Each structure stands twice: as structure tokens, then as C-alpha cells.
């Protein structure tokens, strides 16, 4: 069932977009290889999460 991975990824990248608007979210703890997350880090993370959400959306629609 091609839809299970696509659908999960859609949910997960959507929530990850949402969680990144909150600066205190535990979603910021997954960048284990950065010691001190600074302003320029967060801004590039915000952009990468948005792009990945748009990828996940196209792949979901491609699976249906």
C-alpha cells in the first residue's frame, strides 16, 4: 500500500512546519550535531521544513 508512507510523511512534515513557529518546541532538539542553535540556524531550518512539506504533499498526491 503505497499510501501508508506517503500519508505518514505528509502528517509528519505538516506538524513539523507547525512546531517550528514555536521557539520552545521540542522539535528544536533533534539537531544533535549543533551545540548552540542560533538565529541563522532556525531560519534555514524553517525554510527546509517548508520545502520538505511541499515535497511530501506532491508525493502523497502522486500516490493517490
Amino acid at each position: 500500500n503505497r499510501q501508508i508512507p506517503a500519508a505518514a510523511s505528509l502528517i509528519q512534515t505538516a506538524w513539523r512546519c507547525y512546531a517550528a513557529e514555536n521557539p520552545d518546541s521540542s522539535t528544536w532538539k533533534i539537531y544533535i550535531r549543533i551545540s548552540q542553535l542560533r538565529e541563522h540556524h532556525r531560519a534555514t531550518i524553517k525554510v527546509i521544513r517548508r520545502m520538505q512539506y511541499f515535497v511530501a504533499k506532491k508525493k502523497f498526491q502522486q500516490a493517490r
Partner: protein, 139 residues
């Protein structure tokens, strides 16, 4: 739907990706930033990402396309994705089932992330996150 303060903020973010300063974002520069974050992107992943945003098809992202992406319905898509895991046709699945799908499939969220969505998404306070509550949280 775009503040002028947002536009300059997005211009600054654009700069962090376009390090050569030629007004464009290539797959190499996206790869460079992601590896700088400790991520391990695949060259197809980088291609899917550029393709999703690159509206003119010249293989690269310049700032108007960046601006559009950051400014960009999603509701029904999220609803369809939730129904994929809807067994009994109820408006919900158990928190344990949700924790499984979120942690063991697709992106693989962390357990503290799933704790967070679970606490935040039970808007009505009855102990059960349903689909409609989840959607409203994101919208």
C-alpha cells in the same frame, strides 16, 4: 497576505542559502546548508525539493520563487492522510496507534515531539485527540 517586514526577513533567509550571491539557489547550496545542519540529504531529495519550488523549470530557485514558496486547501490533504490510518471509520485512532505511526513510519518523529502534538492537539480537553481537533490545531 505578505507583510513588508516578512519580505525582508525572507530576503535575509534567502541570503543564507545563496552563498555565492548570484541571486539563485542551486542543489549544491541546499545540500551544503543541510549538511551544515547535520542532516544527510540524498541527491534525489535535493532534486525533489528544488523541483517543488522551482516554478520556471531552470533547475534553480531565485528569490521570487522563494518568496512564493514561503507565502503559500492543505486541509483536505491532511484529512485524506489521516483517513489512510482510519480503520473502523471513527473520527479518531488511539494515542498509542498515533505514537506508532508518527515514530515508526515516514519521517520518524521523536517521542518528545509526539508528546508535544498529543498535549497540544486535545483542544476540547476530553483526553482524545480526534482528526478535526488535529486539523484545527494546524490551521
Amino acid at each position: 497576505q505578505l507583510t513588508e517586514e516578512q519580505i525582508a526577513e525572507f530576503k535575509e533567509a534567502f541570503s543564507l542559502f545563496d552563498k555565492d550571491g548570484d541571486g539563485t539557489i542551486t542543489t549544491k547550496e541546499l545540500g551544503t546548508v543541510m549538511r551544515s545542519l547535520g542532516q544527510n540529504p540524498t541527491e534525489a531529495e535535493l532534486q525533489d525539493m528544488i523541483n517543488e519550488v522551482d516554478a520556471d523549470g531552470n533547475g534553480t530557485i531565485d528569490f521570487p520563487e522563494f518568496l512564493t514558496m514561503m507565502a503559500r486547501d492543505s486541509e483536505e490533504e491532511i484529512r485524506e492522510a489521516l483517513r489512510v490510518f482510519d480503520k473502523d471509520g471513527n473520527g479518531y485512532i488511539s494515542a498509542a496507534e498515533l505514537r506508532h505511526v508518527m515514530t515508526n513510519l515516514g519521517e520518524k518523529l521523536t517521542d518528545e515531539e509526539v508528546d508535544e502534538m498529543i498535549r497540544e492537539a486535545d483542544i476540547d480537553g476530553d483526553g482524545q485527540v480526534n482528526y478535526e481537533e488535529f486539523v484545527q490545531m494546524m490551521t
